Amino acid sequence: ALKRINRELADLGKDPPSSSSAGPVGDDLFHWQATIMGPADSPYAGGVFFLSIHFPTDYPFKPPKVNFTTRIYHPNINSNGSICLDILRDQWSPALTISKVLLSISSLLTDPNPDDPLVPEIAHVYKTDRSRYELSAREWTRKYAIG
Amino acid sequence: TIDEGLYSRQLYVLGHEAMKQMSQSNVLIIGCKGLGVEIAKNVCLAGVKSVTLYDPQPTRIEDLSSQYFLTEDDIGVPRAKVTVSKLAELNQYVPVSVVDELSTEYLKNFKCVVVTETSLTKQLEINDFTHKNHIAYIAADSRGLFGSIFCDFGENFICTDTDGNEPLTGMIASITDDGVVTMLEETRHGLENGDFVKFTEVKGMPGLNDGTPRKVEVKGPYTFSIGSVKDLGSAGYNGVFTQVKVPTKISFKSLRESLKDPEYVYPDFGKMMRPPQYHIAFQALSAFADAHEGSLPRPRNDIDAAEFFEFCKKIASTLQFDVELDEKLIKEISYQARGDLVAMSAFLGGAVAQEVLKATTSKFYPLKQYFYFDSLESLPSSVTISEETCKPRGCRYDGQIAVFGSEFQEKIASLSTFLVGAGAIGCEMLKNWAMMGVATGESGHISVTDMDSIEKSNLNRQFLFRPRDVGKLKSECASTAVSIMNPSLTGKITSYQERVGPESEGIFGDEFFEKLSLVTNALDNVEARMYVDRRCVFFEKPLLESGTLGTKGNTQVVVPHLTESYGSSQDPPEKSFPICTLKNFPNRIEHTIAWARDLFEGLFKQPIDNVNMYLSSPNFLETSLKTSSNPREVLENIRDYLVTEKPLSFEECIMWARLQFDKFFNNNIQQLLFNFPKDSVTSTGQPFWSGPKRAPTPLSFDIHNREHFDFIVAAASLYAFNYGLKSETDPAIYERVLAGYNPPPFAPKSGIANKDKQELKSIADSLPPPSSLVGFRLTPAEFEKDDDSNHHIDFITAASNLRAMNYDITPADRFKTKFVAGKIVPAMCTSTAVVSGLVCLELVKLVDGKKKIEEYKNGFFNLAIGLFTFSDPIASPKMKVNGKEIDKIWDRYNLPDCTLQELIDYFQKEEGLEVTMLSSGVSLLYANFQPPKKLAERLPLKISELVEQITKKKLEPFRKHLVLEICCDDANGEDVEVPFICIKL
Amino acid sequence: MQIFVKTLTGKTITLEVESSDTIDNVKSKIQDKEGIPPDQQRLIFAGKQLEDGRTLSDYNIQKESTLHLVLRLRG
Ligand SMILES: Nc1ncnc2c1ncn2[C@@H]1O[C@H](COP(=O)(O)OP(=O)(O)OP(=O)(O)O)[C@@H](O)[C@H]1O
Ligand SMILES: [Mg+2]
Ligand SMILES: [Mg+2]
């Protein structure tokens, strides 16, 4: 538990992820505030998203709870910031690092999955009117993901 | 006619048909000693039609060694006459009687006959009649640490359920014309060849929906074959398969016939040569009793042992048994012939009561036929056991002293136990301790803590409570009841009402924990088990864990410095469904139940909380604007629940219920279908509503339908309760009001400055000021499954059924809805009795202070199949630290309250290890990757001061130790695990 | 022709391929270069995922196309 979390934190400290920066809030080891930078060749370019991660007591035998904080216009992300992800439900094993989850979240930001969406209206717009979806996403990432 | 308010937990184990057939059976019980009375208690709680007792023997003092319904004022009275009055109060639906004399013909009046404390000749005479007349005959006996059970249900017993598992069901993707059936993706049917299944809700093959059983050919973990379905169709789309179970015919043999050729059941596979010994030994006991005017051999007597062994030799020769008798074990049985323990009595009573239920319900697989059990490893060896010390002393503990002696009685009488929880297992454990006399000496004590209150549903298996006790604290009732059972425990019991957890450390501190002798868990959640395990590890105290699940049960023993802790044996976690599945794409009734639960919470709980907080917090709106994820949602909820949609009578509540029905079952489905039409395809060209996705269909409100009316009634009742109005149930008013309702037009919408801020301000300025409404509060609807008149389960059932109708899913009745939504754990009284017996049998091992790990046993059992197993505890893992052997669990470092720099220097010097991380709970005190300035600022502080500064919380005055977790690297740079640090403040 | 493929780590890999080359061949090359199994490869170009059994030309992939590879999953 604590040793595994500290090992992950030390590994993150030694190697700067550049595109990511996760760390405990204040001095609490069971509440982290990770930072993600929007991909350049994506509608979310030039945006910073802050996520809250809460580790369960039985970590790593249980997946952590990850929630977005910055507003995002994505098919698989609800208003509450939830994430429609598989590795957090069943594929979770006591072998996946938080860095892998952050990389997966970056990939999900890179390309959505409208086939099994979480926000049906956004998915419908994505499948029907791609340009309107792009414009709305850019407007949102400029209004919310900057400053 | 089944009382679902009392047998709520038992119905999930037995069923409606099982209990209905059980409530028509009469049970006669011959013998009313501890085992007999325990069996009677379990049967009465079970719910049989009636119970008849027969025991004319006058009471004696030693008979109180295990009979908890006898008092010293009852000496000289027949046991049945003084037991019937106390037994009749356990359950109001189970009459209890007493018969003065027993004629053979009278036996025709009963359905089951249980026999204890009867000679072999009388047992044979009774069985020779109860066999050919098709009456169940069960004979039980308990001699010291040995027990025997015999079952005989006739030669043509029909058993319906053979394993206790529900029939295997699954959802079918499609079936070809060759009988090949495949489940959905990554779904295992789990069936085997030769099984029978039935199909329902299959599209394209309606004929297969009739349900006629068909053969099963397992073609793989995900596919199987049923045969030829050419005639009925060519291809079947979707559908559900359900296992079909066929009854089995089991033929028992009578006692007279089974004496010569017995059929044994082995309770443990490491020692399978004992039961042949016990079969002879018990018969020898009966013969010796017949040879000495019914007087059993005196305790630890050599002459009587020799005579008993002679009887054993004669009987073995007579019955042509080609087994070489073991003199040691047989003479051991001779020594304990007059013994009478309460743990063995409880264990065998639970088992035999389960057998009676099997006989009555024609369910589960019964014993076939002999079951001989022994716990001889529990006999103490650190005290003096002989004929001089084991002689009776004329006290109520003679039945135990005759096995253990006075020295072990003193050892027991000075215990200081701690029982956590007061559930069924807690009550049974307390009863056993009261009977054994645990902590009745000068230095003894008992403490029991539990924070729950007695409910009606708890009365089915907690026999220390009564209907007049509903609503009171469990600990008080248990303490008073056990003081009444054993007057010597007056003032020797302390009952708390506190939840054992991190917040109770102010009461259960070091002073409390340093005087205990053992800790016994009776909890039902893993969190408390883990916390208690950590506390025991810190204080090094023996622990007794026990758990049940329906008819399965397990018991574990943790001994300091000897075995591993319970946390290392953590169970797999629970299951949760993807949010995307629950929100939009359900495919099972569980999904709809979870969705209905969320709907309930979001309708009657959260808006109410927001409104109340707005009318309580002076600065609620501003905080919620910049705190809530959807401040607009909060503001709209407040506006709707204050001004826009504030009901004035019940008619408005009905109108609101109709509006909510349309909004949740007609408009949302239309919007979802608009986003994803029924003909939509994926990015790969595959159809969308295929496989795990089912196309929903909007529902039109039909008042005459039952489910719609139920939903309307439930929603109106909950809304009125929220607003504190008066509900009504006559259909006339509902029909009148809902007749004149005009649904507002709705069509799916595609969408397509500071107006938003101005919209929020417009919402806000419409809200009445908090001062205008002072003292006006709305009552949220807190979910409560146990109350049947709060319309909670009704609402969940109605909503789940409606959503199932949306997605063409099979609705479930109120029974299954209550089972799933409330996460009710099935429980039985027999399982409780068995687990209590096992725990109390391990307790005497703990008292003796046995050191070897082969002397302890963790037990597991399943009564649906008559399975019992015992395995040695796992030894604590060891490790190498600084070239020394260290126990991973039971080791710690004890250090004073020194500064951080001194601690680091000590670890660098004494242990030769470099500290890289130091934390205290959930706070990071020190790390090797922190900036130098912060470290230099933190080094000269003492640990207590550092913890207070970092945690922003002063240490409590009662704190006397700190548990620090340290990760340190070796000299080479290799991480090495070390035990925790116990800083002594 | 030549193309560039960008990974989740920001790395760019230059590949010499043909529009008629199958997606299987590209995934095999990617596995050879990085050791990432083809099943776990998710190639994206212009918001479209390349699928096995097709060719680059099927996706209008042309000279020096800035493609991308990301982890595989779903849910
Ligand atoms: N942390 C705890 N501290 C103290 N007592 C606890 C704790 N957790 C559970 N208990 C007690 O454990 C007992 C649980 O036993 P049981 O499950 O048979 O009863 P119940 O929870 O009232 O009933 P049901 O399981 O039918 O809902 C209750 O007495 C509860 O008070
Ligand atoms: Mg309760
Ligand atoms: Mg419970």
CATH number of the domain to which A115 belongs: 3.10.110.10
Q: Which two tokens stand for residue B873?
A: 């505890």
Domain B166-244 architecture: Beta Barrel (2.40)
Buried b (16+ CB within 10 A) or exposed e, B667-676: bebebbbebb
Q: Which residue type occupies B363?
A: K
In whole angstroms, give the CA distance from residue A28 to residue A50: 17
Q: Say which experimental method was used.
A: cryo-EM
In whole angstroms, give the CA distance from residue B83 to residue B921: 55
Please tell me what DSSP assigns to residue B745.
P
Q: Is B580 a catalytic residue?
A: yes
In whole angstroms, give the CA distance from residue C4 to residue B966: 48
Every domain of chain B and the residues it spans: 1-114, 115-165+245-410, 166-244, 411-569+825-891, 570-824, 892-985
Say how many C-beta atoms besides its own lie within 10 A of residue B598's C-beta.
13
Q: Return phi, psi of residue B967, to 5°.
A: -110, 120
Domain total for chain C?
1
Task: Return the closest-CA partner of residue B487 out of B918, B70, B3, B927.
Answer: B70
Q: Say if residues B115 and B139 touch (Cβ distance below 8 Å).
A: yes
Q: Which residue type occupies B757?
A: K
In whole angstroms, give the CA distance from residue B769 to residue B615: 9
Q: Which two tokens stand for residue B182?
A: 């495949």
Distance B467 CA to ligand 1 centre (A): 19
Q: State the residue for tokens 């992800």.
A: A85
Q: Residues within 5 Å of ion ligand 3 by Cβ?
A: B 524
Which of chain C's residues have a Cβ under 8 Å away from the Cβ of A19? 9-10
Q: Which two tokens stand for residue B279?
A: 């079969």
In whole angstroms, give the CA distance from residue A20 to residue A12: 10
Q: Which CATH number characterizes residue C42's domain? A: 3.10.20.90
Assigned CATH for B1-114: 3.50.50.80
DSSP run (H or E) holding B532? helix B526-539
In whole angstroms, give the CA distance from residue B321 to residue B309: 15
Q: Which residues line ligand 1 (CB under 6 A)?
A: B 9, 421-424, 449-452, 457-458, 474, 499-501, 523-525, 528, 825
In whole angstroms, give the CA distance from residue B133 to residue B126: 11
B9 assigned binding-site residue: yes
In whole angstroms, give the CA distance from residue B130 to residue B355: 17
DSSP run (H or E) holding B53? strand B50-54
Residues 6+ apart with CB under 8 A from B891: B979
Class of domain B892-985: alpha beta
In whole angstroms, give the CA distance from residue B963 to residue B950: 16
Distance linking the first and last C-alpha atoms of chain C: 36
Task: Return the closest-CA partner of residue B366 out of B152, B45, B111.
Answer: B152
User: Residue C75: which of B578, B683, B684 has the nearest Cβ?
Assistant: B578
Pairing of strands A65-68, B975-976: unpaired
State which residues form the domain around A107: 2-143
In whole angstroms, give the CA distance from residue B146 to residue C58: 80
In whole angstroms, give the CA distance from residue B492 to residue B448: 11
- In this structure, the residue with its CA closest to atom 11 of ligand 1 is B421
In whole angstroms, give the CA distance from residue A14 to residue C29: 32
In whole angstroms, give the CA distance from residue B831 to residue A144: 59
Beta-carbon contacts below 8 Å between A and C: 41
C75 falls within a domain:
no
Assigned CATH for B411-569+825-891: 3.40.50.720
Chains near C with 3+ CB pairs less than 8 A apart are: A, B
Q: Which two tokens stand for residue B403?
A: 């096995």
DSSP per-residue codes, A34-84: EEEEPPTTSTTTT-EEEEEEE--TTTTSSPPEEEE-S----TTB-TT--B-
DSSP per-residue codes, B703-724: TTSHHHHHHHHHHHHHHHHHHT
In whole angstroms, give the CA distance from residue C66 to residue C15: 11
- In this structure, the residue with its CA closest to atom 3 of ligand 1 is B499
The CA-CA-CA angle for residues B632, B634, B640, to 5°, reads 100
Residues 6+ apart with CB under 8 A from B387: B298, B299, B300, B301, B302
Show me where chain B is broken: residue before each gap, C-N > 2.5 A: 752
In whole angstroms, give the CA distance from residue B872 to residue B268: 12
Q: State the residue for tokens 């916390």.
A: B531
Say how many C-beta atoms besides its own lie within 10 A of residue B76's C-beta.
9
In whole angstroms, give the CA distance from residue A58 to residue A8: 16
Q: Say if residues B125 and B107 touch (Cβ distance below 8 Å).
A: no
State which residues form the domain around C8: 2-70
Which of chain B's residues have a Cβ under 8 Å away from the Cβ of A117? 580
Topology annotation, domain B570-824: Arc Repressor Mutant, subunit A (1.10.10)
Distance B458 CA to ligand 2 centre (A): 7
Please give the number of the atom of ligand 1 that sits closest to the Cα of B474.
29
C52 falls within a domain:
yes
In whole angstroms, give the CA distance from residue B911 to residue B968: 10
DSSP per-residue codes, B66-106: T-TT--GGGTTSBHHHHHHHHHTTT-TTS-EEE-S---TGG
- In this structure, the residue with its CA closest to atom 30 of ligand 1 is B452
Residues 6+ apart with CB under 8 A from B414: B439, B441, B442, B443, B444
Residue contact B922–A80, C-beta within 8 A? no
Residues 6+ apart with CB under 8 A from B274: B329, B372, B374
SS3 state of residue B595: helix
Q: State the residue for tokens 């493929």.
A: C5
B115-165+245-410 and B411-569+825-891, same CATH topology = yes
Go through chain B and tell me how many residues it has.
985
Catalytic residues of A: 84
> Is B115-165+245-410 a domain of CATH 2.40.110.10?
no
Q: Residues within 5 Å of ion ligand 2 by Cβ?
A: B 452
In this structure, is the dihedral angle defined by the CA atoms of residues B389, B390, B392 and B395, taken in order, positive or negative? positive
DSSP run (H or E) holding A121? helix A120-128
Q: Which of B524, B784, B786 to mutate to test the pocket of ligand 1 (most atoms within 8 A of CB)?
A: B524
Q: Which of B11, B427, B430, B450 to mutate to test the pocket of ligand 1 (most atoms within 8 A of CB)?
A: B450
Q: Which residue type occupies A116?
A: D
Task: Return the closest-CA partner of residue B839 out of B353, B402, B419, B265.
Answer: B419
Task: Return the closest-CA partner of residue B580 out of A65, A125, A83, A88.
Answer: A83
Which one of B151, B390, B580, B829 is the catalytic residue? B580
Show me where chain C is broken: residue before each gap, C-N > 2.5 A: none
Domain total for chain A?
1
In whole angstroms, give the CA distance from residue B218 to residue B238: 19
Residue contact C8–A107, C-beta within 8 A? yes
CB burial of residue B214 (10 Å; 0-12, 13-18, 19+) = buried
Q: Say if residues B526 and B571 touch (Cβ distance below 8 Å).
A: yes
DSSP per-residue codes, B780-845: -----SS-SSSSHHHHHHHHHHHHHHHTTPPP--HHHHHHHHTTPPP--HHHHHHHHHHHHHHHHH
B89 assigned binding-site residue: no
